[PDB]
């Protein structure tokens, strides 16, 4: 019902990420640039994940699909069934 959710990654949330980043000062143009890179990254992982879901004739995406996806993408996550 809200077809453009990329926005829900709110400026403050991105600021905080950037803080953990160790960033002191943030150009305004960033947020959108970030939102975009986020979108790509999620898009890429979730594609591979759903591939894995679909390959197992499941209608439900599992935590393991997301790990198999993150491992392929070279982006390996510990603590969900690794």
């Amino acid at each position: 019902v809200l077809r453009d959710n990329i926005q829900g990654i709110t400026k403050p949330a991105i600021r905080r990420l950037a803080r953990r980043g160790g960033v002191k000062r943030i150009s305004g143009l960033i947020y959108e640039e970030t939102r975009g890179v986020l979108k790509v990254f999620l898009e890429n992982v979730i594609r591979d994940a759903v591939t894995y879901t679909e390959h197992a004739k499941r209608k439900t995406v599992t935590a393991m699909d997301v790990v198999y996806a993150l491992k392929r993408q070279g982006r390996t996550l510990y603590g969900f069934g690794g």
Partner: protein
């Protein structure tokens, strides 16, 4: 009137968030995104709550990783503000793009 000088809170804000580990994106928003993005690949999907969380951990870790690479490029150009050009440069040298 009492106010802190530009980039003083910012620095506190760093120390705060570097000491902690909690996900910094409000969870519902993030979840909604993920499903919005799942539509692009298969209609009427469903997600294990742990899957949604296994993504957010991944994304948040990536972004925080980028901004560190990003932030060293800003600093490379004797700056302190991070700018799209910096991310662009970082992704470039990483291999995320041409």
């Amino acid at each position: 009137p009492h106010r802190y000088r530009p980039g003083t809170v910012a620095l506190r804000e760093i120390r705060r968030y570097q000491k902690s580990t909690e996900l910094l994106i409000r969870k519902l928003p993030f979840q909604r995104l993920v499903r919005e993005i799942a539509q692009d690949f298969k209609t009427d999907l469903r997600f294990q709550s742990s899957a949604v969380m296994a993504l957010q951990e991944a994304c948040e870790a990536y972004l925080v990783g980028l901004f560190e690479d990003t932030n060293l490029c800003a600093i490379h150009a004797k700056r302190v503000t991070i700018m799209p050009k910096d991310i662009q440069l970082a992704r470039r040298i990483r291999g995320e793009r041409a």
